[PDB]
Amino acid sequence: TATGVAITGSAPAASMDATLPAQLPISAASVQSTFTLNLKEIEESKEQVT
Amino acid sequence: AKLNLAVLNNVFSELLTQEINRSATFLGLLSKYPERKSNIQWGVGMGGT
């Protein structure tokens, strides 16, 4: 603050700024995907697709 | 109170006699083939003329 006092005044009260945090968290979750493919499906599709 | 009576050790001999019958006779002469496909399809010809 910057207030106006008299010329013979008495030095008004103090003030400062303030700095604040944000804290923005990540370790909770994760996006994922699965397949479940066989071992014989991979074999007969190496000769039956163009 | 014999000197070596409880300090005997029982040792088997090399006489394994496998007595089960695991015989694969008809499988042993079929001329094995591989098949990396879904199913075998072949053609059978009939009459008609």
Using the 8-state DSSP alphabet, how is residue A30 labeled?
-
To one decimal place, what's the resolution in Å?
3.5
Give the dihedral sign, CA A39/A41/A42/A44.
Answer: positive
Neighbours of B34 (CB within 10 A): 5
B9 close to A20: Cβ distance less than 8 angstroms: no
Chain A within 8 Å of B41 (Cβ-Cβ)?
A: no
Determination technique for this PDB entry? cryo-EM
Chain A within 8 Å of B32 (Cβ-Cβ)?
A: no
Residues of A near B (Cβ–Cβ under 8 Å) read: 43-44, 46-48
A48 close to B38: Cβ distance less than 8 angstroms: yes
Residue B35 burial by Cβ neighbours in a 10 Å radius (0-12, 13-18, 19+): exposed
B15 close to A25: Cβ distance less than 8 angstroms: no
DSSP string, B2-32: -TTSSS------S-----------SGGGS--
Q: Residues 6 or more apart from A11 whose CB is under 8 A from it?
A: A5
